[PDB]
Structures are given as structure tokens and as C-alpha cells.
Amino acid sequence: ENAEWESKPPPPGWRPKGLLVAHLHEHKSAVNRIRVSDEHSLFATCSNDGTVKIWNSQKMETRSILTYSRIGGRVKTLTFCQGSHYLAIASDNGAVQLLGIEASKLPKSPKIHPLQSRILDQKEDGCVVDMHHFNSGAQSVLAYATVNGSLVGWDLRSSSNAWTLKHDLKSGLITSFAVDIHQCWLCIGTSSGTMACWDMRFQLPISSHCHPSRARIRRLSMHPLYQSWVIAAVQGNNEVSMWDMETGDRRFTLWASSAPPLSELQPSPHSVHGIYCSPADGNPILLTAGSDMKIRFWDLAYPERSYVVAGSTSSPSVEGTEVVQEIQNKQTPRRGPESLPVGHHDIITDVATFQTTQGFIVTASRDGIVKVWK
Amino acid sequence: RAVKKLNANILYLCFSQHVNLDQLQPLHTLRNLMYLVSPSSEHLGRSGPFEVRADLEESME
Amino acid sequence: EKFHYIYSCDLDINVQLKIGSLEGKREQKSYKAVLEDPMLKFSGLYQETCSDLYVTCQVFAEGKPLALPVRTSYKAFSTRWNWNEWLKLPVKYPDLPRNAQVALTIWDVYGPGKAVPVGGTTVSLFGKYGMFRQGMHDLKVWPNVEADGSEPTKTPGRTSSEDQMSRLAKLTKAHRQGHMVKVDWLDRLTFREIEMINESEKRSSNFMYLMVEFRCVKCDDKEYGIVYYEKDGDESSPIL
Amino acid sequence: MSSMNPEYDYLFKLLLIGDSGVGKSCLLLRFADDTYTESYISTIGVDFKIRTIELDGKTIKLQIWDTAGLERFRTITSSYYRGAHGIIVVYDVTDQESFNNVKQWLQEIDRYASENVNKLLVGNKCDLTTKKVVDYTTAKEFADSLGIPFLETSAKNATNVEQSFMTMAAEIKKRM
Amino acid sequence: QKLYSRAQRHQEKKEKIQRHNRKLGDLVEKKTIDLRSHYERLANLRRSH
Amino acid sequence: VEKNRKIVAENLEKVQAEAERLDQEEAQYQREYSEFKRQQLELDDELKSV
Ligand SMILES: Nc1nc2c(ncn2[C@@H]2O[C@H](COP(=O)(O)OP(=O)(O)OP(=O)(O)O)[C@@H](O)[C@H]2O)c(=O)[nH]1
């Protein structure tokens, strides 16, 4: 009855203007995930350079307040655990490490130390592909998904697994999963475009629905309102589509491609890599960024008001399913100098937000850049 | 505030080029640019992961 | 907000158990065995789809019977083995030790003068932490064997698990009792999945189950759980 | 005052209960989907179908719930009855035991359902006349003795199936 | 008989994807060497400028 | 008829024994192919990023 979607939702009528606050490059290569501590006091970004870096949300008026590197391999997913006390990270090394964060006052330097660890045999589980943490009081389970389809709920209260699910690999590689804010159900998105719903109460596979284009589920999120809807980001055409798992109908879609809406023909190579969704004032906001490196603010209540956040007006402006279609407009005097391109210049891999006294967007790309916006 | 901006700005540009961390100081406005514009900084023009390290942030803050 | 309970030694009344129904197909022997011994033809397995089975209910403990075996009164069956009989067991709650067991054997006729067991199921009267069995239970009936009350029981009616339906049934009952969070859109799907699983188990296996029920003792609109306890178990030893 | 959906005025949650094999799923399927089938899948837990109907010019949305009738999926306390607007007790007119257990299903209503919930005794499988055991008079005497409406029916042949659910919807509207 | 063909075709798919994986890693290796040349051309042009 | 039943029962058993072996093999093809797919889905992003 009372599961809040966000510990701190966006301010009322929040509209990210696209002002860059911090340009960060402390990572040697591609950043894989951006996660914000549920306190919004810190956030963390992991990278293919094998390091993870933790950042102070309040210092985004900049420096990696903490850093860790002693796992090796590409660290490609992390999550906080409903507080800045714990932060878990995982690498293609198959190591799952529970880092404890030490919060200190200004005079004494902070530190990170590993306080829990697991290793996955590459022949029997493979590395993780995604993970999520969700408290239930009696347990502090860290669910994570592995290449062999195992989805394991590691209870951070001990070494015991709360539960384990065996995704049918005939549906392809697990590319992302999400869990209900109510913790009643779960949905697995795959490289072949299949969403497979699991009822976490019974731990049974209740349903399987497949994208008609049979294309990779790049991100998966529960819907902030409709308890049976899953926001599945799909490869090609920047397609973000809400799927009602109670019936399998694709019943809302965001589209931004040269290909006409929902067409299976030659899809654009661009794809959405990060989706942030919030109910706000009951007017749900969905913010997407990806391989076209253009952050799009989508207003699901008034889609005509949707706009590109990652760029000024120097850039070219823009089946019974409610599809929002983006069509580029069919559009010298040196009226002041040309400014530097503020946006990313490489594939954006994730989007996150924090609300420390203002609504900031964090974005990161495959070159290791991390950018803060407001 | 303009001096704070300009000096912090220069230092940020200095760090972006991986200039010698021990030489740069937050007050020596023109000397900082001199180390950046002269051939002494072999890395000038390179684009890569600068870090604005703690030993240089603590001097500013 | 409150848990109400009583000690097994304070409740000086006879234990009572409802023999419910028996669910599941009964394995018919191939006629090859009927040729080996022709008296099989007259057993209740072959003469009628539902035979007039009966259930014995001996309370065992430490591998010894605590008392004489109570048995279900005769009830005619046509299409469903269903007894709705509260057997007043011959032992009282203070007479029961922590490892007390009911050994529910199901019997059928085998010609004149000779009963034969359809199956048997043994369930401990006290749960994981000494509370007496609180309600309806579906016990796995081990076929063709008489229920054994030795400890450990070779024919346990319950599992700690280890198969789908033993877990999904517990969750189903918990969901019915309202213990599990209701979600109409999920339930309408997950229970279809459990239906498929159960119907598969009903085909790939021929196990049967015996429903039983224990009386929920009440007082002033409160229901008291019975906890295995001992008079003098209340005092820690005064060792100096 | 309260919010009101433009499609339906009243949401009447109906619930079907009764012993296993009495035909609750068949009745639910015949009413909400006009389909019938010999294949028996023993229901577990809950199932429901929505059917929209019209009575006295009012659009009535019926959410009909089908509970598991088997011993193994039943429990002493039940929370399916909670919030039911009307409850149908089904029995198989070809099995006296299912009819006898109606007495026991009724006391579950008086214990867990709404204090004045609508009740309706339904006698499915009336098409098996050569196998019927209860008399219509035996059932009517019992139903009237408790004031609950009653309709013998057949999911197989749709016989009185529609009328059985429509009658309870009307009875609930009459109650509110 | 349907499984024998599947085992064959899945094995051919495993071989094909493994060969494709090899060419992508080699292509990225080569493209990185060119990107290195681009970044050095840019570094030299920038420094001269 | 018992002889024929026994012979056919062994045939069904031994043919199904191959079916379950192929099930383990196909399960292994998926388990391995999923790994090659994971790698491929990164090389494609590295290629596009480079
Ligand atoms: N002749 C006849 N047979 C029926 C009728 N309705 C149901 N049946 C038979 O009874 C079987 C079981 O019907 P169900 O509706 O599944 O019984 P149920 O009440 O749902 O039983 P549970 O799901 O276990 O609670 C069906 O498969 C049919 O074979 C009917 O109206 N006439």
C-alpha cells in the first residue's frame, strides 16, 4: 500500500534545462552503471577500467571522493543498499564484492573496504549482468543475474541465498531485469527481446512476452504507476516501450527513428541505454539517453512537450498503441562565437538523478565521461 | 569572484592536459598558463582522463 | 498483535483429528499380478472405482504406540473418498511427548477376513518449534505400505520442500489464509502456472494425499496454540 | 460522493465456491467466455473473469471469482470471501455429498463473508438426468428454508447459466 | 531427428558466432590503432596551433 | 506380447535416453552461446564507441 517509488522524487514540475554542472573523466574507459545512493548523498559509477568511483552529490557545484580498483576485470554493475552504509559491485571477473563505505567528518579522510565477497565460477554461473538491491526488513537481499540465467537473491544479512531463479536461456542472455517496488514480481529482459515475468512470492515463471522485432532489451524498469507495466528499452530506433505483462500488449511506445513507427524494417543503430522514470506530480516523466548521445526528456502526459536536454537549438530540432514519434524538422552570420558542444560525444550508457537541493541528472558514456546536469 | 573563476578555470585546464602536478599553484595565474602553453608540458593537446587529484584540490579548498 | 497459547500439559482434553478426504488416483495392478493370485480380483481395488476405505490413527512416540488405534466409522463412497469424521484420539495433550506422531494408514478389503493397506502417512503432532499442528494439512500417502511411526518415520506425510507442489501448496494455503500479499493480476496468472504444475504432477506421478485437520481450541473469541511444555520444565535448575 | 468509471456503474465481485468437480470453473467459463470443455484441471487458489452486463438500464461489471474446491488448496480461515458482494454455492446434482457439504459451505459464508452478503445455491450438471440424485424439491426446500435464491443449471448446455449470474447481480443491486 | 538437426545448426551457430566474435575483437584492435593515430594527429595539430 | 512389450519398452527408453542427452547438449549450447553473445554485445558497443 505504501511503497514509495523514490526516496526523493523530482521537484514539482521539474524540467531539466540542460546546464552542465560537472564534466568528469576520472575513469579510463567506458562507464557501465550510474547508481545514486537512496540518501542521494553519494552516487557511484563503475567502469571497464576495473575501478569504481564514488562521488559526493553535494560537491557538484568535483572529484572522486572515493575510489576502488582491487577486483580487476571490467566492473560493469553496482548498487547501493538503501543507505550509504553498503555498496555492492560486480565485475566480469565473476567476483561480487560488498564494499562498505566509511563516512567521516571533513578533517579525516574517508575510506572504502571490502566486507563481503562471492565468486562465480565462469563455467557454472558466468559473471553478473545486472543486480538490484531491495530491503524487506527481515532481509536485505541483493538480487543479481548471471550469464547462465541464474538470478540469485543474496541476503546481505548472512551468506545465505534468500532465493534463486533459473531463467530459461532459450530466451537468450539476461541483459537487464527489474523488480517490483512491492517486491511481488520480477521481469527478466533478454538479448533476444524476451521479457519473462517471475512472481517473487511463489518464485515461478508466470509469463513470457517477446518483442516483435526480436531485439535486445537494453534496460528494463517497472512502471512508476501501472503495477503490471514494464518499461522495456529496446535496441534500434531508440524504442522505449511499455509492455503490460498481464496480457503482453505493447501499449505505449517512445519512438525516434528514420524508420516509421513500430516497423521491423532496417532499424536505426541508435538505442536507448538508460531510462529514468518518475511519477512526479502524477504526470510521469521518462528521461532517456543512449547511442545517439542525445538526452531526451519525454513527458508521458503531454508528449508534444518532450525535448532534447543534451543540446541547444544549434542541433536540428524535432496499431492502437500510443506511440510518441519524433520527426526531425526540415530546417554565415557569426552572431557571437560558436560554443563548445556541451553534450557527450560517445554512446551514453546510463542515466541517473539525485535531488540534493536541486534536480540533477548524471550521465555517462563509453569513453568514461561522466556529466552532471541541472 | 572573477579571479576565483579565472584561476580555478586555468587550473582545471592545466589538469586536463596532465601538466606537472607539483608545479601548479592556485594563485600563480600567469605562471600556470606558462607551464601549459610552453613546450615544457609534453602532453599539451592530449584528450584523456584527467583526475584533478586530491593533492591539488586540497590546496584550492 | 498478540499470540495466545497454552501448554500441552495444561490442556487435559483428548486430542482430536479430522480425517478429511483422500485425493489422487490409486495405482491399479497389471492383470499379470491378478493371474499370479486370483484373490486380487475381489479386492476393493478392482471391484469399485471408490472402495469403502477406512483410516487408522495410532499416535506413536519414540517408535512406540501410545495407545490403541482409533479408526474411522464406516462411510460409503461412490466417486470420492471423503470422510468428515473427527476421530477422538485415545491420548490427551499432556500425554504427548515432543516427538509424538500420528500414523494414518488407509485400508481396503482384500477378500474375506483380510484388510490391506492402500497407503500410510505419518505427521508429527508438534511442528518445528513445539507448537501443535494448527490446522488443515495435506499429507503425502506412501502407497502400498502401512504408515510407520518409528523415528525417523520411513513414511513421512510432510517435508521440511524438495519438490514443486510441496512448496507451492504451502504458499497457496498461506495465500488463502491471507498471510500472503494479495495481487489480483499476479494471482490470476501464478495460480494458472501452479495448476499446470499440479496437473503435470498428477500425470507424471501417482502420489495421493490425505487431508487431516486439527481442532483450533478457542476461548472468549481467542484461538490458543498448544505448545509442548512440561510441568517443572518451567524451573531452571538451582545449581549452586 | 465518489469517483465513478464511465463504463460501469456498479462493480459486483461474485465468488463461486463448492466441492471439487461441481462445475465452478465450467460455470465461470461458460458465463464469461461461452466456452465449455471436458478437460478437467483442478483449480488452485483463485481465478477470476470479468463480464460486463446490463440490468434495468444499469451497466453492471461482474468480477466472478473461482476458488479451488479441493481439500489440499483449502484452509480453515479463508480470505477470498472478504469483499465479495455475492457468493454462489455450487453443488453437483449428481452427487449427494456435494449437496450435503452445502451446509458446511454456508457456515463459512456466515463466518468470513460480509454479514449480509447475497447467497445463491446453484445445482450444476442438471443435464445428467439419468445420473441425478437430488430432487429439485429437496434443493428448493433447503434453499427456501434459508431464504437463499436457487437455480438448477448446466454449464454444459448453458441451461440457466446466464440466468443464475444475472439473478445474483440483480439481487445485489436490490441490496444496494 | 529434429534434435539432431538442431544440435548441428546450433553447433554451426556456435562456430559462426565464435568466428564473428574473433573478427570484431580484431576490428576493434585495428580501429583503436587508427583512433590512436587520430588522437596523435589532433594532439600535434593542437600543440602546433 | 510380453516379449514385444519389453522390447518396445527398451526401445522407447533407449531412444528417450538420447533425447535427454541431446537436451543436456542443447542446454550446453545455450549456456556457451549465451557467453559468446555477451561478448559480442560488448564488442558491438566498443566498435560503435571507437
Ligand atoms: N455433464 C456435465 N458435466 C460438467 C458440467 N460442468 C462441469 N462438468 C464436468 O466436471 C468437470 C470439472 O468441472 P470444473 O468446473 O473444473 O469443476 P470445479 O468446480 O472447477 O472443480 P475445482 O476447480 O477443483 O474446484 C469438467 O471437466 C466436466 O467434465 C456440466 O454442466 N454438465
mmCIF file of C-alpha atoms in Angstrom, chain E residues 3-4 7 10-11 13-14 17-18 21 24-25 27-28 31-32, chain F residues 18-19 22 26 29 32-33 36-37 39-40 43-44 46-47 50:
data_model
loop_
_atom_site.group_PDB
_atom_site.id
_atom_site.type_symbol
_atom_site.label_atom_id
_atom_site.label_comp_id
_atom_site.label_asym_id
_atom_site.label_seq_id
_atom_site.Cartn_x
_atom_site.Cartn_y
_atom_site.Cartn_z
ATOM 1 C CA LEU E 3 17.080 -32.547 -32.371
ATOM 2 C CA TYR E 4 19.939 -33.896 -34.496
ATOM 3 C CA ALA E 7 22.415 -29.904 -32.496
ATOM 4 C CA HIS E 10 23.248 -24.775 -33.021
ATOM 5 C CA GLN E 11 26.829 -26.013 -33.316
ATOM 6 C CA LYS E 13 25.778 -21.094 -34.900
ATOM 7 C CA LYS E 14 28.312 -21.516 -32.096
ATOM 8 C CA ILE E 17 29.315 -16.540 -33.609
ATOM 9 C CA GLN E 18 32.754 -17.525 -32.347
ATOM 10 C CA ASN E 21 33.444 -12.575 -32.207
ATOM 11 C CA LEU E 24 35.049 -7.971 -34.061
ATOM 12 C CA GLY E 25 37.818 -8.043 -31.471
ATOM 13 C CA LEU E 27 38.443 -4.986 -35.905
ATOM 14 C CA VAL E 28 38.286 -3.052 -32.635
ATOM 15 C CA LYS E 31 40.235 0.662 -35.132
ATOM 16 C CA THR E 32 41.963 1.506 -31.849
ATOM 17 C CA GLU F 18 19.353 -39.983 -26.358
ATOM 18 C CA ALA F 19 16.662 -37.289 -26.211
ATOM 19 C CA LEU F 22 20.686 -34.045 -26.506
ATOM 20 C CA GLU F 26 21.395 -28.191 -26.334
ATOM 21 C CA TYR F 29 24.988 -24.891 -26.439
ATOM 22 C CA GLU F 32 28.040 -21.353 -24.083
ATOM 23 C CA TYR F 33 26.322 -19.323 -26.809
ATOM 24 C CA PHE F 36 29.623 -15.654 -26.787
ATOM 25 C CA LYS F 37 26.551 -13.434 -27.131
ATOM 26 C CA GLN F 39 30.967 -10.840 -25.512
ATOM 27 C CA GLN F 40 29.553 -9.983 -28.944
ATOM 28 C CA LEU F 43 32.343 -5.762 -28.994
ATOM 29 C CA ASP F 44 29.498 -4.179 -30.954
ATOM 30 C CA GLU F 46 33.141 -0.999 -28.393
ATOM 31 C CA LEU F 47 33.111 -0.867 -32.189
ATOM 32 C CA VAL F 50 35.578 3.569 -31.078
#
